[PDB]
Design a protein around this ligand. Structure first.
Ligand code: CNA
Length: 208
DNA sequence: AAGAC
């Protein structure tokens, strides 16, 4: 029975991602990622996206494996103007923190009723890579590090200190340079042309 | 290209 670590090694996973509005980035680089619950209790300021939290876990931080939830991400970029960024996170989070693993969006009826304890552990992690996820047939050519369903989600039930953030992606040079001046020990990356295959792209295009 | 109920 493979461990989470052995799955990461075997599939060549190198990145977890979390998209967020640039308005949140100072707070995140200072204090780490925190759940909506934990943000409320510390009276910290945040711009959140989800009004509903149908997942039912406002004490969880939501990540992606290898590629953002491009669908949900694009939606919220349309609804909220200004610069969005993408945090890249050490895959170590998956074993070092209290994670649940969901093969599709964690708010989906297909998964959200299951005993949360069954969604922890290497068995649930491996299901992100199944040949069929609730009707999505995994493409034979999809590289091993990608989830079958682009909306596959990691719910992290504790804070993620800023040291687990390995880089941040910006939509323009000036955003990256602003945050680099503030956090000179950190890696701040950017795209010069967004007419390109970028982490802001739909995945089918990115991998095309 | 626009989640989830
Ligand atoms: N953000 C993602 O990459 C992502 C990925 C996969 C799924 N989701 C789903 C969408 C939904 C949660 O929506 P989401 O948009 O993430 O809202 P949310 O309810 O978690 O809102 C929290 C917001 O606060 C932000 N935040 C975290 N730590 C801090 C901090 N220290 N200072 C300031 N802000 C902070 C975080 O980036 C996010 O925008 C769940 O149902 C998930 O299942 C989101």
């Amino acid at each position: 029975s493979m461990t989470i670590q052995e799955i990461i090694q075997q599939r060549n996973i190198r990145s977890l991602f979390h998209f967020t509005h640039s308005d949140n980035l100072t707070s995140i680089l200072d204090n780490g990622l925190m759940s909506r619950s934990e943000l409320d209790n510390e009276n910290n300021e945040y711009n959140c996206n989800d009004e509903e939290r149908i997942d039912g876990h406002p004490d969880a931080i939501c990540l992606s494996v290898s590629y953002p939830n491009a669908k949900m991400f694009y939606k919220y970029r349309c609804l909220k103007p200004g610069d969005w960024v993408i945090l890249e996170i050490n895959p170590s989070v998956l074993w070092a923190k209290d994670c649940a693993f969901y093969p599709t969006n964690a708010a989906s009826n297909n998964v959200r009723f299951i005993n949360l304890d069954l969604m922890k552990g290497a068995e649930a992690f491996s299901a992100l890579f199944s040949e069929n996820v609730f009707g999505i047939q995994r493409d034979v050519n999809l590289p091993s590090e990608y989830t079958t369903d682009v909306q596959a989600a990691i719910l992290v039930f504790e804070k993620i200190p800023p040291s687990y953030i390995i880089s941040t992606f910006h939509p323009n040079k000036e955003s990256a340079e602003h945050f680099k001046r503030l956090y000179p020990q950190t890696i701040q990356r950017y795209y010069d042309n967004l007419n390109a295959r970028t982490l802001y792209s739909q995945r089918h295009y990115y991998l095309g």
